[PDB]
A paper describes a structure:
In the case of the glutaredoxin that is the focus of this study, glutaredoxin A from the cyanobacterium Synechocystis sp. PCC 6803 serves as the preferred electron donor for the 2-electron reduction of arsenate to arsenite, catalyzed by arsenate reductase. As part of the thioredoxin superfamily, glutaredoxin A shares the characteristic thioredoxin fold. The structure of the wild-type protein is comprised of the major protein secondary structure elements: four α-helical segments, and four mixed parallel: anti-parallel β-strands that form a single β-pleated sheet. Our random mutagenesis approach has yielded four new crystal structures of glutaredoxin A, one for each of the following variants: R27L, A75I, A79S, and P84R.
Author numbering: -10 to 88
The structure:
């Protein structure tokens, strides 16, 4: 196990769980995607183009909301494009990501 290792009782290593439900061609979804990509974070996109079932699954987790996109971090609901950009503008997004 050669290398410069970091020790702080992590045990098994996980990182921020970031999810975004999208339509690929939605300009608001695209805008939210761009922000996340710029940050360089690892995340999961659920592109649900024309997928009615997945939308109902999304709405179940997002306060019944069916608007796109819907964003989650560590299983907490962040909201849509405006929401994440508002958090970033007030310096609240990076420590959720989480740095």
């Amino acid at each position: 196990m050669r290398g410069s290792h970091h020790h702080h009782h992590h045990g098994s290593a996980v990182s921020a769980k970031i999810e975004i439900y999208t339509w690929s061609t939605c300009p608001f979804c695209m805008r939210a995607l761009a922000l996340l990509k710029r940050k360089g974070v690892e995340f999961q996109e659920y592109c649900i183009d024309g997928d009615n079932e997945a939308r109902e699954a999304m709405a179940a987790r997002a306060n019944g909301k069916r608007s796109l996109p819907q964003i989650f971090i560590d299983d907490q609901h962040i909201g849509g494009c405006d929401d994440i950009y508002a958090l970033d503008g007030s310096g609240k997004l990076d420590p959720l990501l989480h740095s």
